[PDB]
TrEMBL record, chain A:
GO terms for biological process, alphabetical: dGTP catabolic process
Keywords: Nucleotide-binding
Pfam families reported for this sequence: HD (PF01966), HD_assoc_2 (PF19276)
PROSITE patterns in alphabetical order: HD
UniProt key word Nucleotide-binding: yes
Residues that coordinate or bind ADP 1: I7, Y24, K202, T226, R313
Coiled coil: none
Organism: Bacteroides thetaiotaomicron (strain ATCC 29148 / DSM 2079 / JCM 5827 / CCUG 10774 / NCTC 10582 / VPI-5482 / E50)
Domain HD: 55-167
Record lineage: Bacteria, Pseudomonadati, Bacteroidota, Bacteroidia, Bacteroidales
The protein's name: Phosphohydrolase
From TrEMBL, chain C:
Name of this protein: Phosphohydrolase
Record keywords: Nucleotide-binding
Species this protein is from: Bacteroides thetaiotaomicron (strain ATCC 29148 / DSM 2079 / JCM 5827 / CCUG 10774 / NCTC 10582 / VPI-5482 / E50)
All copies of domain HD, residue ranges: 51-163
Binding site for ADP 1: I3, Y20, K198, T222, R309
Gene Ontology annotations of biological process type: dGTP catabolic process
Stored Gene3D superfamilies: Hypothetical protein af1432
Length: 403, 403, 400, 406
């Protein structure tokens, strides 16, 4: 019998219908509300000022597409029980809950060796306790431990609701191009064969488009050189903060940020000391920006110069090469920066970065189902271009340094 | 003054009073109001109702923007040259009759729209006392400032920049949308040839992929291929019956081509051909089909009724040629099912094929200009796109037949 | 489910069975050859959308409306949902080409609503009574009365589609009337459609936009003039036909030109409906195209004006047009064209004007269950004043 | 081309071109970059999670439109010298520069009696000194003290680029497609007659939609009652934090925020003491949210309950009435909440709010737009419009809100 719903506005996909009960209670939970304070692609806003969308919007967006995908799969003779529908919807609402601000930066700096996927499971278990086991089936699906295995695939896999949301929403908000991966269309082509997700043959060119757009998104947005440079500055800022902290230097920070600056939190500490998760939960983009804003006037020349560059958008110069960067160049620039900033040679390392560089080539193996029940790999189904070659490794070296 | 015409795709289209408005209000351009841009596509995409008139105006709007942009980047264009390219683009598709390619294959054989466009341009030029002479010279690529012609016809022409966008908009195939106005903003000239500024590489990457998507998703949609084969049969049967002296309902203009054998020689040499061709639009074709659907001939009427009632030939495709034994089997089944001769059943079985190289420098070879004046082909400028990725021979063998 | 593309609302799912059988029926396929606003494309070239798209779009909106109403605990049986879905697919099926023009000229005294019912009954026979509930709802003869109101009334899916689609395709403004949102705010109170208070401004917008669509598009002076020209053309063709003059026409069109079909003849002689069914825009345009070379000066001049877009000049007044002005122009035209003074009446036209003000009386339901008329609920502007008669007087005449 | 131009992507309007030189220098200036950290409609995101756009975006967008407006006006023959073009472009880049985070809320709480308009001017003059007087003409046009007066009208007025951006952008980001306007289209119908802006009669339809869209966005978005309630909560929280601070209680705060919580800044003090501007410049939304985040665990029951409500989006219940709220209801609620939360009756005042609005829906300051015809005739839109007349639009609205802890 039809359920009552709350309605949220989403410019990308329209009206998001949220059933009252568990699902709406997830949306209103403090753990999902904190995602209104974490940008989806916060390192991209420096290139693409419109990229202000939140991880909250992504999670609702992915939910929307999940709802639609349930309806479409049932319509095609794939039975899904109401509890499975509910479970897969709660999974998708929660899938990204373990992201902190600039999550990958944190994993490389002050919250080392713990991944957002691990934190998402902890936070789901925590919430399941609070909701007295109502998320158990969601978690079981999330962990791919449920016998109906296409349901997990909707949460995590080549055709997951997560990437069908973010690839579209990130493009929509950056304004990078005016093109459109067909997220709502892709979902209407979805079916199950042998307990795995396939796409109907009428959706073939949509999948080639999808697969191509995905690679272009990486080059145009995610691996854009200005955003890589910006990321390297943030990594250096926080590693310098932790070095100063360890020396007992005083740094402005909210209590939750202070926890990770003045303690050495690593994988084992994080899982064993419950204070870590409690403090992690209290971190969002505000904690990071507030630090950078205050640090920009800190006496330390390295921390202040980095921090001021972040807030005032004085971005490192970036060069890219097809071959590694020569030790000669690095030494040269480090010296010149040492001199220009009046810092030691070792301090000048913070101002020179040489990061390397796509995703699992198997993501490109989508199976297409024909009206006569036959199945082909998209690479054979395809007419537009050579899908096999979309995954040829492109080696791209970056040189980032103070300008 | 200037006249303003609304266009949902691009907004206000501004048409200067004088020669350009005179072109727009001319009977030869007004008639394109009654010829669809993609008439065979509405059978799949009911939204695809846009006319060749809209496309002409649309390409004219884009041309006007291109002139402004090119002049703002320091490319000298005289007012007479501007006017001439504007006129050329208004007139570029003027020689299309209803279902133009179908007519070239059936009852107006061996004459292309390109030849007819030129005849009509010359005809209008006489009426307008030589005012289109420069436009015609640029149209033909016989003018020494060569980038102007490139805006009419070439990899970046205003024609495809209109149609890819317009066709996408009206079909609702948003995966083929292009940033037509964005591409124009990145347009420039280097060595009397059109180039795109490096900041527009992403726009061009989408442009090249969208063109491929629209090719297979819309223009070569198999339902549209089937429909076209049916129209080709219907008109051929009509010409066969007419040559036997059978009476067919037809407008005088259509009657002319049904009851005379018009070929290339005849078309150029007998001036009645062009006079009657000018009077053909989609209404002449659909009225014939509507009335012929009650004709006593079984072949003609069954084809005609299939057209108007949208009972379309079943269509199969194969990567290899259709077997002669399959064809004979179907032809025999259909001859029996409809009670017609084996020879007559030929009209109800068709085996068109496409052999296409997906990489074609005529559409793909676009040069990118950098801030330092260096120029790279898009295949080198693109991190993702490259000649190998795009180079792909596709062979598709269709089998279309009465169900 | 079959899936069809609609740029205005997205993908339209059509259940296999009855509903898809309606979509693919010859009677609905013919609506692909009749424009929703065919006299508008002369001003707005993008306005090429068909009655077929409108029917599918209204259907899309119906499907969403059902879901939403049931979500709020208004019970709809599956057969009722299907009924209302079928009704809205079929609601405009009785439109011929330029349907109001035909009702004023060569298919006089028969309304599209009447013809829609006949065609529904015809299809119901073919379909073994599967449309009986749909027809009963269409007639407002079913006791669950909010269902009919979805098909026809102040908040019907008909106008929620066409107000949006007509704006979309004309490109008249970049505004958006907001049709899918309005549906999400629908509820039933005392067996009638209401809107939740969260949608109040959506509704003021909707009511305002509707008026602006009337003035900007539906009553645009160039379109009025164009209508008058087509009216004259067809009346002249009927007159010539009645004198025994030969006119090019498809058999279907010939039937209405060479016989005098009125209300009683239409309902009593079954050849009428049969021929009407076979009329679409192509029959009218092919006639105009051929008539543009007809020996008759009145017919050919009118027809050539249509096909070449040489539109009557239009003036507007607040007061009726003076008889002396009319006589003056008629004389000038008779002289300029070399036709009799009576014949010159074809080239001078003075039509007058909005819709039922009760269409503006939508009820708003608040969370406490209280109900107010939108005019009291409203804060944006004076809803009551939207229906203040605007008296417009048109003078359309052949130019030169 | 003689100078390099920087191109910034905008989803709303596309490529935004910034000439190298003064204009790009303004865009890259730390005072404009800080607008990347201040939301355009920060109180709306609570209802419209898509409303994440920044004052920086709005600035760049209004500038984009201005660029097109200059081009369009000069194409209809109007004289805009390159220095006036530049000036009007710099004026619009800078027009909202004086907004701090939740600027109106600050004016009502801890930076009282100073409008963003005043602060914008102060920062414009500050930047002018930095740039050796290059912004002088721009300031002059901003102030409406330039003799070519239609230029100022492009910055501020019934057809200014400010509203032509924000109505479109706000509509785009909220997802209220009903408030969309054809900004570019309006600009294409723009001209000057008698040193004032006019709209060509072919644009009447756009101007009709423009005026209705403005009124819809006013009620649907800007005065959405959830947004009104959120704003009241934040006003309470900051007032309470200033109360506790004046009593010497210690509250977490960035230096810049601390300066306003631990000093009483008023109009006199803001203009006369230069530390006020220096610290204001350093405030953005991060300062406010980091305070609320840490205060949500503060010992004070009032502050912490308010703060946790903000961050967890447990918003005050909101009622509206056409008539004033009865003092009997107010006391009843204040008493209930005082008991429910275990705070003094005086402290429960923080949890009950009765703000109100009186609004004339017809304001010629927004609505009086002149339409020019082909024959040079001019009619006010009210006469030019078949539908939209003064009587349709003239409407006094009185709303009384009742916001309180739920
Ligand atoms: N102030 C700014 N704010 C946001 N984005 C900018 C700004 N300036 C430039 N951009 C965008 O970010 C990209 C990188 O800028 P940057 O690295 O500073 O210049 P460059 O074009 O020399 O690499 C540019 O391509 C431009 O689109
Ligand atoms: N009656 C119709 N009118 C317009 N479009 C239709 C109709 N029926 C189906 N379509 C669309 O056209 C496409 C081709 O339809 P068709 O070739 O008849 O069926 P099939 O899906 O078996 O190929 C379908 O994918 C569908 O989206
Ligand atoms: N050739 C054309 N095709 C389509 N629309 C046109 C054409 N010429 C003008 N229009 C549009 O139709 C409207 C009516 O044009 P018309 O009545 O001929 O001229 P006027 O603007 O003098 O009334 C105009 O406002 C214009 O936007
Ligand atoms: N968690 C949320 N985040 C963002 N927006 C929400 C959330 N919950 C509801 N909304 C939206 O904000 C509006 C106001 O919500 P709220 O005032 O809490 O509930 P009510 O609908 O009872 O007024 C709703 O109409 C809804 O669309
Ligand atoms: Cl189960
Ligand atoms: Cl693009
Ligand atoms: Cl208020």
């Amino acid at each position: 019998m039809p359920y009552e719903r709350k309605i949220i506005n989403d410019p990308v996909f329209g009206f998001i219908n949220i059933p009252k009960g568990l699902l709406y209670d997830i949306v209103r939970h403090p753990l999902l509300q904190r995602l209104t304070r974490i940008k989806q692609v916060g390192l991209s806003s420096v290139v693409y000022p419109g990229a202000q969308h939140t991880r909250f919007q992504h999670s609702l967006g992915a939910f929307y597409l999940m709802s639609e995908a349930i309806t479409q799969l049932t319509s095609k003779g794939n039975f899904i029980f109401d509890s499975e529908a509910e479970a897969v919807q709660a999974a998708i609402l929660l899938h990204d809950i373990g992201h902190g601000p600039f999550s990958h930066v944190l994993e490389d700096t002050i919250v080392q060796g713990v991944s957002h996927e691990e934190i998402s499971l902890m936070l789901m278990e925590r919430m399941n306790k609070e909701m007295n086991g109502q998320l158990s089936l969601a978690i079981q699906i999330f962990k791919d431990e449920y016998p109906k295995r296409f349901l997990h695939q909707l949460v995590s896999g080549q055709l997951d609701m997560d990437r069908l949301d973010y690839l579209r929403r990130d493009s929509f908000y950056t304004g990078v191009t005016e093109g459109n991966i067909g997220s709502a269309r892709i979902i209407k082509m979805l079916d199950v064969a042998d307990d795995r997700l396939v796409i109907e043959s009428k959706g073939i060119y949509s999948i080639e488009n999808f697969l191509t757009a995905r690679r272009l998104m990486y080059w145009q947005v995610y691996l854009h050189k200005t955003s890589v440079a910006y990321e390297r500055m943030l990594i250096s800022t926080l590693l310098r903060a932790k070095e100063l902290a360890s020396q007992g230097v005083e740094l402005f920070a909210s209590p939750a940020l202070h926890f990770f600056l003045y303690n050495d939190i690593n994988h084992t500490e994080f899982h064993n000391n419950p204070d870590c998760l409690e403090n992690f939960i209290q971190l969002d983009d505000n904690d990071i920006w507030t630090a950078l804003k205050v640090w920009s006037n800190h006496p330390d020349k390295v921390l202040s110069t980095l921090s001021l560059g972040m807030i005032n958008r004085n971005i490192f110069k970036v060069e890219n090469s097809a071959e590694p960067i020569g030790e000669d160049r690095i030494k040269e620039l480090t010296l010149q920066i040492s001199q220009q900033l009046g810092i030691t040679l070792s301090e000048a390392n913070y101002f020179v970065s040489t990061p390397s560089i796509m995703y699992d080539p198997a993501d490109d193996s989508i199976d297409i189902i024909y009206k006569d029940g036959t199945i082909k790999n998209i690479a054979e189904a395809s007419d537009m271009l050579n899908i096999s070659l979309l995954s040829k490794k492109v080696k791209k070296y970056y040189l980032c340094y103070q300008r």
